[PDB]
Design a protein around this nucleic acid. Structure first.
Ligand SMILES: NCCCC#CC1=C(N)NC(=O)N([C@H]2C[C@H](O)[C@@H](COP(=O)(O)OP(=O)(O)OP(=O)(O)O)O2)C1
Ligand SMILES: [Mg+2]
Ligand SMILES: [Mg+2]
Ligand SMILES: [Mg+2]
Ligand SMILES: [Mg+2]
Length: 539
DNA sequence: GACCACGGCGCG
DNA sequence: AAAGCGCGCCGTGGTC
């Protein structure tokens, strides 16, 4: 391209280079723009940002987040990554997309700007005639990138002092556990090494190996294996407790306080828009979509996520979302009827599981039943089912047969979905988001059947994902108008932050927006809570 | 120092 | 572990 002075004209595509991948932490090393056979390189990148009306190009959101960080209201616009991701969700990296659609991802901003321009041209062309994918781009993905930029730049408050204190307490208990484990082993070793632990359990102590690891075929020391060995030796329960504590300390308690941003005083994640096979978002650096909640210590950690002083967190979560979606997709009368009657399948399974009346089911019981309900739906084996329920194999098989015999059109929907995936080479969500599954025609059964589980899951998980994205796009401007903030998405959950005076109004509004986003054959129900911290807001 | 595969496990 | 699906991050073991 012909080199030309900064600034570029309107509609130009940007290229940019960051010192590190995370936009909230990155130095803007270079900035350029391309349009009409010209490339414009900015002598001073930060100041040059002010000249742009929008960030149009590869990874547009990252530049937008950096702009917002610097106090500049620069929205992201067209991004070839989003076009490519819709065409084929295995398109996840600029490296791959460039290679596939007409160029090379290099480390020079001008080259990135020029690449953005031509990739957009090519990809836009491939989306001609693809009316449904075009709709998803214009109505969902492109607007959502703006919403996500604001969420990333906003961050969430964390009680750092609390976590520091908690680390010390957890360290002392970890020391107790490891010392006990070493005593029981008769000698110290690296308890963080599963290789060393395997030898202790299975070679030194008398314990029977139960399972093998996937890639290298070592004797597994996974939680499932240790659970089954709980009564065989006192060391097992001690290892399980050590694992829980060290996992939580090493992954959350210790790293998170170190990641508070010096300017904002908050914790900032990345919401990756082109990262999953189904259309879900992912979260990284740090991942805020896997903050603990199941165990007592996990709950103590989740409580560290707090509202700003004078504000409250609002948490909203779609009820039984994939089951409702499945009802719509399959058109099963029985399942549709369940939701029209305001029933709860998770609670019902739980009452059966623990052998108590439906009223006796506590949240932890219901949560246990969730894994069982979705596990069975998406192809869990009776053996695993019997194992995790500690019921005879015969009981497990019986639960699975009744699970499906109750809802006839579900299996039919599955069969049709798989048959159609074999024919077209892809499956699709309600809105037409696609996932290619070539292994549906694999000649190897285990490979083929794994592919089948991936394939029929995708329309369900993906439709739920599409619905949440659409809801975020609708909700965001309403929140802006109310002075509320959208902070996090966790798949079928949103966490907002609202001024205390407006918190109740915001909760009601958000619930209605989420429930009314795109009506299905069954009602969408959203549960909502309000609190000073993430845990309190979910109760 | 960074990268990697792996086993493992946190969430949905 | 086992025929649930979808992710990202941990330490280890290892390489470069
Ligand atoms: N390890 C976490 C324990 C609880 C769980 C779970 C899920 C599992 N195991 N598998 C899924 O596919 N899940 C998919 C299907 C769900 O519909 C969706 C949202 O998860 P959720 O909000 O926890 O469950 P829910 O929306 O079905 O139920 P509710 O509690 O929100 O009413 O995510 C969730
Ligand atoms: Mg839910
Ligand atoms: Mg949820
Ligand atoms: Mg892995
Ligand atoms: Mg290893």
């Amino acid at each position: 391209l012909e080199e030309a002075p900064w600034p570029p004209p309107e509609g130009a595509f940007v290229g940019f280079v960051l010192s590190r991948k995370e936009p909230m932490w990155a130095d803007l090393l270079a900035l350029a723009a391309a349009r009409g056979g010209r490339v414009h390189r900015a002598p001073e990148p930060y100041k040059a940002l002010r000249d742009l009306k929008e960030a149009r190009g590869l990874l547009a959101k990252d530049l937008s987040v950096l702009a917002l960080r610097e106090g500049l209201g620069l929205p992201p616009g067209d991004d070839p990554m989003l076009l490519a991701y819709l065409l084929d969700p295995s398109n996840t990296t600029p490296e791959g997309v460039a290679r596939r659609y007409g160029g090379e991802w290099t480390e020079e901003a001008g080259e990135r700007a020029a690449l953005s321009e031509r990739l957009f041209a090519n990809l836009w062309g491939r989306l001609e005639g693809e009316e449904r994918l075009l709709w998803l781009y214009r109505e969902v993905e492109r607007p959502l990138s703006a919403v996500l930029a604001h969420m990333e730049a906003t961050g969430v408050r964390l009680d750092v002092a609390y976590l520091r204190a908690l680390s010390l307490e957890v360290a002392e208990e970890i020391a107790r556990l490891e010392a006990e484990v070493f005593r029981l082993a008769g000698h110290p070793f690296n308890l963080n090494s599963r290789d060393q632990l395997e030898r202790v359990l299975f070679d030194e102590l008398g314990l029977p190996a139960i399972g093998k690891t996937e890639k290298t075929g070592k004797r597994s020391t996974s939680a499932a294996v240790l659970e089954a060995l709980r009564e065989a030796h006192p060391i097992v329960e001690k290892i399980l407790q050590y694992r829980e504590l060290t996992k939580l300390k090493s992954t959350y308690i210790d790293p998170l306080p170190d990641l508070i941003h010096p300017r904002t005083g908050r914790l900032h994640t990345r919401f990756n828009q082109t990262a999953t096979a189904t259309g879900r978002l992912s979260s990284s650096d740090p991942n805020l979509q896997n903050i603990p909640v199941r165990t007592p210590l996990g709950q103590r950690i989740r409580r560290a996520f707090i509202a700003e002083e004078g504000w409250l967190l609002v948490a909203l979560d779609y009820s039984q979302i994939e089951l409702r979606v499945l009802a719509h997709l399959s058109g099963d009368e029985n399942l549709i009827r369940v939701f029209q009657e305001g029933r709860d399948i998770h609670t019902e399974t739980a009452s059966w599981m623990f052998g108590v009346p439906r009223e006796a089911v506590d949240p932890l019981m219901r949560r246990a039943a969730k894994t069982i309900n979705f596990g069975v739906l998406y192809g869990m084996s009776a053996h695993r089912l019997s194992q995790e329920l500690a019921i005879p194999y015969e009981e497990a098989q019986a639960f699975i047969e009744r699970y499906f015999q109750s809802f006839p059109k579900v299996r039919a929907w599955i069969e049709k979905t798989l048959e159609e995936g074999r024919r077209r080479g892809y499956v699709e969500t309600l809105f037409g988001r696609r996932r290619y599954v070539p292994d549906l025609e694999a000649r190897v059964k285990s490979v083929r059947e794994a592919a089948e589980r991936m394939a029929f899951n995708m329309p369900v998980q993906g439709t739920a994902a599409d619905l949440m994205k659409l809801a975020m796009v609708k909700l965001f401007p309403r929140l802006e108008e109310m002075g509320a903030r959208m902070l996090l998405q966790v798949h079928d959950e949103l966490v907002l932050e609202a001024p205390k005076e407006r918190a109740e109004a915001v909760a009601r509004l958000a619930k209605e927006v989420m429930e009314g986003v795109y009506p299905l054959a069954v009602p969408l129900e959203v549960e909502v809570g309000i609190g000073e911290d993430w845990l309190s807001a979910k109760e």
